[PDB]
Design a protein around this ligand. Sequence first.
Ligand SMILES: CC(=O)N[C@H]1[C@@H](OP(=O)(O)OP(=O)(O)OC[C@H]2O[C@@H](n3ccc(=O)[nH]c3=O)[C@H](O)[C@@H]2O)O[C@H](CO)[C@@H](O)[C@@H]1O
Ligand SMILES: *[C@@H]1O[C@H](CO)[C@@H](O[C@@H]2O[C@H](CO)[C@@H](O)[C@H](O)[C@H]2NC(C)=O)[C@H](O)[C@H]1NC(C)=O
Ligand SMILES: *[C@@H]1O[C@H](CO)[C@@H](O[C@@H]2O[C@H](CO)[C@@H](O)[C@H](O)[C@H]2NC(C)=O)[C@H](O)[C@H]1NC(C)=O
Ligand SMILES: *[C@@H]1O[C@H](CO)[C@@H](O[C@@H]2O[C@H](CO)[C@@H](O)[C@H](O)[C@H]2NC(C)=O)[C@H](O)[C@H]1NC(C)=O
Ligand SMILES: *[C@@H]1O[C@H](CO)[C@@H](O[C@@H]2O[C@H](CO)[C@@H](O)[C@H](O)[C@H]2NC(C)=O)[C@H](O)[C@H]1NC(C)=O
Ligand SMILES: *[C@@H]1O[C@H](CO)[C@@H](O)[C@H](O)[C@H]1NC(C)=O
Ligand SMILES: [Ca+2]
Ligand SMILES: [Zn+2]
Ligand SMILES: [Zn+2]
Length: 721
Amino acid sequence: WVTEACAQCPEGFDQPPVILFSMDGFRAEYLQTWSTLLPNINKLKTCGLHSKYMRAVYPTKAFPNHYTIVTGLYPESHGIIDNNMYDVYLNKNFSLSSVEKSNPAWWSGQPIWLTAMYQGLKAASYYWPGSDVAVNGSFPNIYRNYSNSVPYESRIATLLQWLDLPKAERPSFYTIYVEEPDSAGHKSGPVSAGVIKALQLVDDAFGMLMEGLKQRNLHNCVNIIVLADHGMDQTSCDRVEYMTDYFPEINFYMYQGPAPRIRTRNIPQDFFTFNSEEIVRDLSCRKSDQHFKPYLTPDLPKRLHYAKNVRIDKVHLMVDRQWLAYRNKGNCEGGTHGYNNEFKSMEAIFLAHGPSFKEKTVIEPFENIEVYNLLCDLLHIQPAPNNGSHGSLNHLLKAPFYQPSHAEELSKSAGCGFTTPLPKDSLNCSCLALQEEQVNQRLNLNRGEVSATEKTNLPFGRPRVIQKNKDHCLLYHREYVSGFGKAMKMPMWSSYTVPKPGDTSSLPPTVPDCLRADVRVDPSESQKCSFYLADQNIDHGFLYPPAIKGNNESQYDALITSNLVPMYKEFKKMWDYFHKVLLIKYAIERNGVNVVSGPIFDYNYDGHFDAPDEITNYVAGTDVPVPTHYFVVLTSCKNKTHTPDSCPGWLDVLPFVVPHRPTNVESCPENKAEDLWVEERFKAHIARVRDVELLTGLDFYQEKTQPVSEILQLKTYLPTF
Ligand SMILES: CC(=O)N[C@H]1[C@@H](OP(=O)(O)OP(=O)(O)OC[C@H]2O[C@@H](n3ccc(=O)[nH]c3=O)[C@H](O)[C@@H]2O)O[C@H](CO)[C@@H](O)[C@@H]1O
Ligand SMILES: *[C@@H]1O[C@H](CO)[C@@H](O[C@@H]2O[C@H](CO)[C@@H](O)[C@H](O)[C@H]2NC(C)=O)[C@H](O)[C@H]1NC(C)=O
Ligand SMILES: *[C@@H]1O[C@H](CO)[C@@H](O[C@@H]2O[C@H](CO)[C@@H](O)[C@H](O)[C@H]2NC(C)=O)[C@H](O)[C@H]1NC(C)=O
Ligand SMILES: *[C@@H]1O[C@H](CO)[C@@H](O[C@@H]2O[C@H](CO)[C@@H](O)[C@H](O)[C@H]2NC(C)=O)[C@H](O)[C@H]1NC(C)=O
Ligand SMILES: *[C@@H]1O[C@H](CO)[C@@H](O[C@@H]2O[C@H](CO)[C@@H](O)[C@H](O)[C@H]2NC(C)=O)[C@H](O)[C@H]1NC(C)=O
Ligand SMILES: *[C@@H]1O[C@H](CO)[C@@H](O)[C@H](O)[C@H]1NC(C)=O
Ligand SMILES: [Ca+2]
Ligand SMILES: [Zn+2]
Ligand SMILES: [Zn+2]
């Protein structure tokens, strides 16, 4: 097989069997550098399909990741948030060394073997976390109780024996797990002779499987996926942070290593009463060269989706590349994993071979949460509710099983039409510059003016409202278009295409002390300038920056009540710096940039837009809700020769989900100019368009002339730097 050229199901095989092969700790880099040393995996890389890398879930550990691959769920939803965890309600400790690993109470969701079994198919497993557990009261048709020393040849032979079974007994889905190159990675690090030997050993295991399949004439019949749970990075005992250096006495329990959690020792009693906010405060900006950052789980970057679970302790530590965090100075040599999934070293491999996959294809990176829907498509079965975007992986398949469709809008735009240029209520707003209010006629756009602003500022169409009974209206202006939320008295979204900046030297500033009522929106559905007088902590901010487009006359279209959003004074410093300096820099690099911004409400930190009853903070003595986050989605043309409003091909996206916090403690900006921490803070809160979509109840790019499957690739894309 290994010498045979790049190449078909035999009698009794109506549907192609699926084999999911996991090579633990096989980082993406190992394939990029050492593939030519691995002849069997290199043939699979040459002939089959493979991604540049597959993104794992945080923490980049075995059990949360392996269970994510087979469920399509984030650890917070499937329950396995770590290898070591504590549940207060169950009052039990989970570990790989305890019998609690086999307790079905910890395992939520529906793994692929169960999905296949519930839909008339048989499933076998030669090791996989959860497969030796009675998840939802059931085990796979054939399974093996985990035994790490069983030779690879014996595991392969048993799997080939399962494929030799008669059609009635023979399973359609198979899982197989191998401990290497992870074990070698821990011993001597990712760049060692030990990992080379381990990589050659896993190549022999894959070689035995392919040769075994060739013997049965199944090598071009079986749809095989070879992947990893996470990557590997080098550790050092000179790269360890100690909690003794920050606390005089440690009375708390700590889950040590690359993804730390802090909780009380007195469990279950003090679990909820434990001052989690005190610990994060006592660890924030303590040392200038601090190699970790403390966080309360709702404050963690939203793209991680690591907060909505009792097992996820409120205190979390984000550890820097190649560093570790422990209780005391009392392992640390070689290598480990568990770090941020965005780190290059934490990236996993993904290779596919078989009749359902595209031959000799290199695909762009994607997330392991998408594998579940792909496995369902290969097995011709319906997926259970998960976090993958069904259809985003169709570009991997020769003939896709599922055809995705645009999300249907649940609420239509109504009202806010121009009637009179004279406001019925001033809303306690003042603009001494005026005077006449003839600038209100600039808000009265004709049919051709609406079409001109729709073509420029909504080039991919308006974001659709995927919310029931959401009373809203669209507001058209020469420089921007917005979707105003009537009940919350603020826009849900604001869209505008910034053209390529010329001068940049002396740009006009924002017109000060000028704010007035919007004649198009009802006074009862509008924000008042007097609302921001009573509250001292929160002030008003502009969603669309008035001075970014046009002249002085253009600024008046944005200096209205409908462009106001509740903003913390410290947050406004980041927001105004981004729109004045960073946004112009991005518009130069991208040859113009389309911007869609708006508020996010996620008080229950579940990654979904809040229902009105879920909002727990408002502008003092008003019903105006305070956003938990602010989104900024930047869209430009992939081909930089075109502007965002005249882009025929693919698009390039850069979304941000920035926490709306009263302090900038996360950036540690004491005695530091904004050019040293604002960009770093925005970059730390980069997310996918899909993340923005879930947090807002909006759907983007529905008017882009491209198939839904290609648009889903753009929506699941995570920009990296
Ligand atoms: C074995 C090992 O080096 N584990 C390290 C890893 O944990 P982690 O839990 O992520 O495990 P690894 O990815 O390193 O290796 C797989 C582990 O899962 C077990 N397994 C695998 C498959 C299966 O079906 N069933 C099963 O029980 C293996 O016995 C092994 O212990 O990162 C931690 C980071 O803080 C380290 O402290 C741990 O020492
Ligand atoms: C746990 O197993 C039960 C039983 O197999 C599943 O319940 C079935 O769900 C389907 C789809 O909703 C229904 O058509 C069946 O009538 C249900 N059967 C019973 C006995 O209730 C359940 O969905 C499984 N749960 C998970 C998370 O996989
Ligand atoms: C995996 O190990 C468990 C034991 O930990 C086995 O479960 C036992 O199976 C017998 C029947 O063969 C039952 O009478 C026992 O009550 C079970 N014990 C427990 C604790 O569940 C299981 O059969 C093993 N699986 C394989 C494939 O060997
Ligand atoms: C789960 O493991 C932890 C850590 O080993 C145990 O924590 C101890 O809990 C008691 C109170 O029940 C405290 O007084 C001790 O100080 C804790 N020890 C440590 C090392 O933190 C906990 O008891 C275990 N729970 C179960 C149910 O096994
Ligand atoms: C990831 O997918 C899961 C499953 O669809 C989502 O969790 C469900 O959320 C609803 C409430 O919106 C609950 O009624 C279900 O019980 C949850 N199911 C499970 C298995 O937990 C989850 O919200 C999704 N996550 C994101 C961020 O979209
Ligand atoms: C970019 O667009 C121009 C036309 O404006 C075209 O000639 C060029 O080939 C495109 N570049 C790529 C990489 O497709
Ligand atoms: Ca929510
Ligand atoms: Zn692993
Ligand atoms: Zn490991």
